[PDB]
Design a protein around this ligand. Structure first.
Ligand SMILES: [Mg+2]
Length: 314
């Protein structure tokens, strides 16, 4: 009825567990509000608003730059950066060769003919393009120009080209992506790969550390030089770029999650309260307890007057 407001929050798949907690905490404070959450790869999440005509009160992505590139200026005009993450290679203890995989031999294990691994669709999900970025960055770190070629390029139509030191991969439209089903499985968002690994259909998958921990997967920590986790290695990460099918270019960057309130939000006031919760100490702790490092203090890409005291604007 008129005493039941719905706050619509569309978010990155990797924010699924944190969102359950944000929803419970928010509703405890606003008993007449139902926070309606929907998970999808961040680019697909944004398209709900930018292309499908749906209205959301809060948009949260796993890569703040997608809000900037896809929503400015028609659907948003500021982004608050509130969390970080790290790419790891996760598996079950009964995954093929789980007993021998480690940080030094991970890519050789993935190269074995019977090993199947997964990553999400780069056109829809930052985890997917970040997975390809990490594998290509591995070529530079291990001084082995064939890691990406053997694992991905020979098992799909996804290929990195070199251009004066940097590498660029141009994505085919999603409908034209080709994958060798004997070696790789892809899904729109990384969260959808979870059940494939649990069923044994996949042995390994590229995924955020927080999600691996939340779902009880073991994992190989990859070099900081390739895992997109540290602000301090931005210069190395920037050597790889992926051009998404929608034409937007994403560059390897330290993983930083963004949140915004779309310009056309139906319940802006409540949305402000929700964003405040996410970047408050309570919200930072919710993330930490779920295995995801919060960005403390939160930052914004531009002034955000209705939230000035909560954010650092450079
Ligand atoms: Mg190569």
């Amino acid at each position: 009825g008129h005493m039941n407001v719905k706050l619509k929050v569309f978010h990155a798949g990797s924010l699924t567990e944190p969102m359950k907690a944000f929803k419970r905490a928010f509703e405890e404070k606003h008993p007449n509000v139902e926070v309606q959450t929907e998970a999808a790869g961040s680019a697909a999440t944004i398209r709900k608003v930018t292309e499908l005509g749906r209205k959301a009160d809060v948009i949260a992505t796993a890569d703040y730059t997608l809000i900037q590139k896809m929503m400015y200026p028609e659907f948003a005009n500021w982004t608050i950066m509130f969390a970080k993450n790290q790419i790891v290679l996760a598996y079950r203890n009964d995954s093929r060769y789980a007993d021998e995989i480690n940080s030094q031999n991970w890519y050789e294990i993935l190269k074995r003919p019977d090993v199947r691994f997964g990553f999400s669709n780069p056109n829809d999900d930052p985890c997917g393009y970040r997975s390809l970025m990490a594998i290509q960055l591995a070529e530079l770190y291990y001084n082995d120009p064939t890691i990406f070629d053997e694992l991905v390029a020979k098992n799909s139509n996804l290929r990195f080209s070199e251009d004066n030191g940097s590498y660029v991969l141009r994505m085919p439209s999603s409908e034209r992506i080709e994958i060798n089903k004997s070696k790789i499985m892809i899904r729109s968002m990384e969260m959808e790969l979870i059940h494939l690994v649990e069923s044994g259909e996949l042995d390994y998958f590229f995924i955020y550390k927080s999600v691996a921990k939340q779902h009880g997967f073991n994992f190989v920590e990859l070099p900081v030089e390739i895992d997109l986790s540290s602000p301090d290695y931005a210069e190395l990460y920037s050597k790889v770029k992926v051009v998404l099918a929608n034409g937007k270019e994403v560059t390897g960057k330290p993983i930083v999650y963004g949140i915004t309130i779309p310009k056309n939000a139906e319940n802006r006031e409540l949305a402000v309260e929700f964003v405040k919760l996410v970047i408050s100490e309570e919200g930072q702790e919710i993330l930490r307890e779920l295995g995801q490092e919060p960005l403390v203090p939160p930052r914004a890409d531009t002034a955000v007057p209705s939230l000035k005291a909560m954010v650092e604007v450079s």
